[PDB]
Design an enzyme around this catalytic site. Structure first.
Site, mmCIF file in Angstrom:
data_model
loop_
_atom_site.group_PDB
_atom_site.id
_atom_site.type_symbol
_atom_site.label_atom_id
_atom_site.label_comp_id
_atom_site.label_asym_id
_atom_site.label_seq_id
_atom_site.Cartn_x
_atom_site.Cartn_y
_atom_site.Cartn_z
ATOM 1 N N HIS A 83 5.405 -21.257 -1.996
ATOM 2 C CA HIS A 83 4.387 -20.226 -1.811
ATOM 3 C C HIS A 83 3.794 -19.951 -3.178
ATOM 4 C CE1 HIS A 83 3.072 -15.815 -1.452
ATOM 5 N NE2 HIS A 83 2.175 -16.552 -0.824
ATOM 6 N N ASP A 141 -0.417 -17.784 2.308
ATOM 7 C CA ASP A 141 0.338 -16.697 2.928
ATOM 8 C C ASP A 141 0.796 -16.945 4.361
ATOM 9 O OD1 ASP A 141 0.066 -15.214 0.528
ATOM 10 O OD2 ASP A 141 -1.792 -14.266 1.219
#
Ligand SMILES: CC(=O)N[C@@H]1[C@@H](O)[C@H](O)[C@@H](CO)O[C@H]1O
Ligand SMILES: [Zn+2]
Ligand SMILES: [Zn+2]
EC number: 3.1.1.4
Lengths: 118, 118
Positions: A46, A92
């Site tokens: 991420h 996300d």
């Protein structure tokens, strides 16, 4: 932005809050060391995703507000998102999706980083 | 950049590993909530400091390399620094100095963020 990401997280993992990920493993929170499990990995890429997006001119992940939607555990980034928003958004939702599928180990939460993340 | 900030810390607080600040209180690692003490507030002002620097186009506080000298408790950001680098350097330096004047409470290290900052 992170406000939207916090909520993305709850869409896929309603039984939890982003806080369960604020201080998990060696990354979910910041970044350093060797991933601890699948979950601690979801967080590694991420951050990497954000790092790739920062390369997108004028793009600030934690602050760029995107257009997304949550519908019964499934996330969707909308089309009207600028190149920067669209990239961040995807980062996300993929992270959120990755968190829901990975196992959550209480033992890897609130860990002493100075001993497991060098 | 992160590496330079780590040095300022070892500079102002030699009696401690910079890891002693990678997970202290609610802010040393950067987050939110009621600072648990003076040292934590130091980190609170530092994150906010980074956030303002991010408003300067192309400025990544966490990576911006700046010019500074850290000589025995003494920290000096050099003039040859641009707006982004100058701002970043003053954040880290001030935070490094701040740490040096705030008691370090072992209780406040690696605290439960979910329960204590939420
Ligand atoms: C390697 C390093 O110093 N990382 C700093 C940490 O020391 C500091 O406590 C925290 C909150 O200000 O911000 C990080 O960027
Ligand atoms: Zn000198
Ligand atoms: Zn912790």
């Amino acid at each position: 932005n992170i406000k939207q990401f916090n909520n993305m997280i709850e869409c896929t993992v309603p039984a939890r809050s982003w806080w369960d990920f604020a201080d998990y493993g060696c990354y979910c929170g910041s970044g350093s060391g060797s991933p601890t499990d699948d979950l601690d990995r979801c967080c590694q890429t991420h951050d990497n995703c954000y790092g790739a997006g920062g390369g997108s001119t004028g793009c600030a992940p934690k602050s760029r507000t995107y257009t997304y939607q949550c519908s019964q555990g499934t996330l969707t980034c909308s089309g009207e998102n600028s190149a920067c928003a669209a990239t961040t958004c995807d980062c996300d939702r993929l992270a959120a999706i990755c968190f829901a599928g990975a196992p959550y180990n209480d033992t890897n939460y609130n860990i002493d980083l100075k001993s497991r993340c060098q | 950049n992160t590496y330079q900030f780590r040095n300022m810390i070892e500079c102002t607080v030699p009696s401690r590993s910079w890891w002693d600040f990678a997970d202290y209180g609610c802010y040393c690692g950067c987050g939110s909530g009621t600072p648990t003490d003076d040292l934590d507030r130091c980190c609170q002002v530092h994150c906010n400091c980074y956030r303002q620097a991010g408003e300067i186009s192309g400025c990544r506080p966490k990576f911006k390399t700046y010019t500074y000298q850290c000589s025995g408790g003494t920290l000096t950001c050099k003039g040859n620094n641009n707006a982004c680098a100058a701002s970043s350097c003053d954040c880290d330096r001030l935070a490094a100095i701040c740490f040096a004047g705030a008691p370090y409470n072992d209780n406040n290290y690696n605290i439960d963020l979910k329960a204590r900052c939420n």
